[PDB]
Write an enzyme that holds these catalytic residues in place. Sequence first.
Site, PDB file in Angstrom:
ATOM      1  N   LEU A  17       0.816  -1.207   0.000  1.00 47.42           N
ATOM      2  CA  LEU A  17       0.000   0.000   0.000  1.00 47.42           C
ATOM      3  C   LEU A  17       0.853   1.262   0.000  1.00 47.42           C
ATOM      4  CD1 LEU A  17      -2.541  -1.272   2.654  1.00 47.42           C
ATOM      5  CD2 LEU A  17      -2.937  -1.121   0.190  1.00 47.42           C
ATOM      6  N   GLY A  18       2.041   1.170   0.589  1.00 50.90           N
ATOM      7  CA  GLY A  18       2.928   2.312   0.674  1.00 50.90           C
ATOM      8  C   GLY A  18       4.365   1.942   0.980  1.00 50.90           C
ATOM      9  N   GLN A  19       5.259   2.905   0.791  1.00 51.26           N
ATOM     10  CA  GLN A  19       6.679   2.719   1.056  1.00 51.26           C
ATOM     11  C   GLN A  19       7.308   4.049   1.455  1.00 51.26           C
ATOM     12  OE1 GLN A  19       9.061   1.228   1.900  1.00 51.26           O
ATOM     13  NE2 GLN A  19      10.895   1.269   0.609  1.00 51.26           N
ATOM     14  N   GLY A  20       7.834   4.108   2.674  1.00 45.90           N
ATOM     15  CA  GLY A  20       8.380   5.341   3.212  1.00 45.90           C
ATOM     16  C   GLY A  20       9.874   5.312   3.461  1.00 45.90           C
ATOM     17  N   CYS A  21      10.309   6.095   4.444  1.00 42.20           N
ATOM     18  CA  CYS A  21      11.721   6.219   4.777  1.00 42.20           C
ATOM     19  C   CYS A  21      12.165   5.090   5.707  1.00 42.20           C
ATOM     20  CB  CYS A  21      11.987   7.578   5.434  1.00 42.20           C
ATOM     21  SG  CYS A  21      13.587   8.329   5.033  1.00 42.20           S
ATOM     22  N   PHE A  22      11.237   4.596   6.521  1.00 36.67           N
ATOM     23  CA  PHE A  22      11.568   3.636   7.571  1.00 36.67           C
ATOM     24  C   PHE A  22      10.907   2.270   7.399  1.00 36.67           C
ATOM     25  CE2 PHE A  22      13.256   6.439  11.200  1.00 36.67           C
ATOM     26  CZ  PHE A  22      13.832   7.301  10.291  1.00 36.67           C
ATOM     27  N   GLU A  24       7.592  -0.214   5.101  1.00 38.56           N
ATOM     28  CA  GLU A  24       6.481  -0.341   4.167  1.00 38.56           C
ATOM     29  C   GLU A  24       5.141  -0.523   4.871  1.00 38.56           C
ATOM     30  OE1 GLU A  24       7.395  -3.467   1.429  1.00 38.56           O
ATOM     31  OE2 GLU A  24       9.227  -2.498   0.706  1.00 38.56           O
ATOM     32  N   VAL A  25       4.067  -0.394   4.100  1.00 29.74           N
ATOM     33  CA  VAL A  25       2.724  -0.671   4.594  1.00 29.74           C
ATOM     34  C   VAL A  25       2.040  -1.672   3.675  1.00 29.74           C
ATOM     35  CG1 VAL A  25       0.391   0.251   4.695  1.00 29.74           C
ATOM     36  CG2 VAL A  25       2.239   1.398   5.925  1.00 29.74           C
ATOM     37  N   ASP A 130       0.017  15.311  15.662  1.00 26.51           N
ATOM     38  CA  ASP A 130      -0.154  15.357  14.213  1.00 26.51           C
ATOM     39  C   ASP A 130      -1.575  14.993  13.800  1.00 26.51           C
ATOM     40  OD1 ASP A 130       0.919  16.090  11.824  1.00 26.51           O
ATOM     41  OD2 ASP A 130       2.082  14.258  11.495  1.00 26.51           O
TER      42      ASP A 130
END
Length: 260
Positions: A17-22, A24-25, A130
């Site tokens: 579903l996603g991929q970030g700095c730290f 994945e999802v 946030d």
Amino acid sequence: KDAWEIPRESLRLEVKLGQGCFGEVWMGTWNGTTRVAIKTLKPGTMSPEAFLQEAQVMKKIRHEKLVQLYAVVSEEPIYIVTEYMSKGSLLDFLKGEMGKYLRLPQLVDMAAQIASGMAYVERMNYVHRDLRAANILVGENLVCKVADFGFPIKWTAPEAALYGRFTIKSDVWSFGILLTELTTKGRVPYPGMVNREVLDQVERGYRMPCPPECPESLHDLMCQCWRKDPEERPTFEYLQAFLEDYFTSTEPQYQPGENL
């Protein structure tokens, strides 16, 4: 070990579903029976203790309006399993296909849910830091829950942004900014204005105007959330009750419009 720990075999990562700095999802299955949201950590980009922080937080937490933690893999590579929210972020949900049909009654209902989750956060003497659409998850049946609970200048209260004075009252501020997102179908606050203009102007006492077709009583509610005095702001218990009774106590005359 901890009651949370689960065997690595009991996790299936089906859809990315996603991929970030730290990490994945993913959406996946837990025990081949339970659909779940799975978050991963990339070794060498984050400290295990650092990422496995927001997890230790959601351990004490338990509310129907807060994304529920299911299990963990505290050993690297790390995995964090939570309840699955099928509609993604409120922001995407508000901007995409579904947005065009969402009316004032539904948007106020979603606000009431979130305020309910933040009300629990309020009772536990916790702070979010946030609170915004990008961090609210939507599920089946227009359900909305708070997430990511462990610069957004356009969302952050002046005292927090400037002096790092972060409290549940600066969370209430962000809630007022969340109110505009719901009423403009996920449009970025302070349109046309950069981060620098926003800091100056909010400090000058400027506040976002009544969104097109939004009742003045709801924008009035936003302005209460934006009082420059943190303690002037309302509580999430108030906000919650005000939104749940909205169309009876506040706007009994409500009639559907083109967008709201």
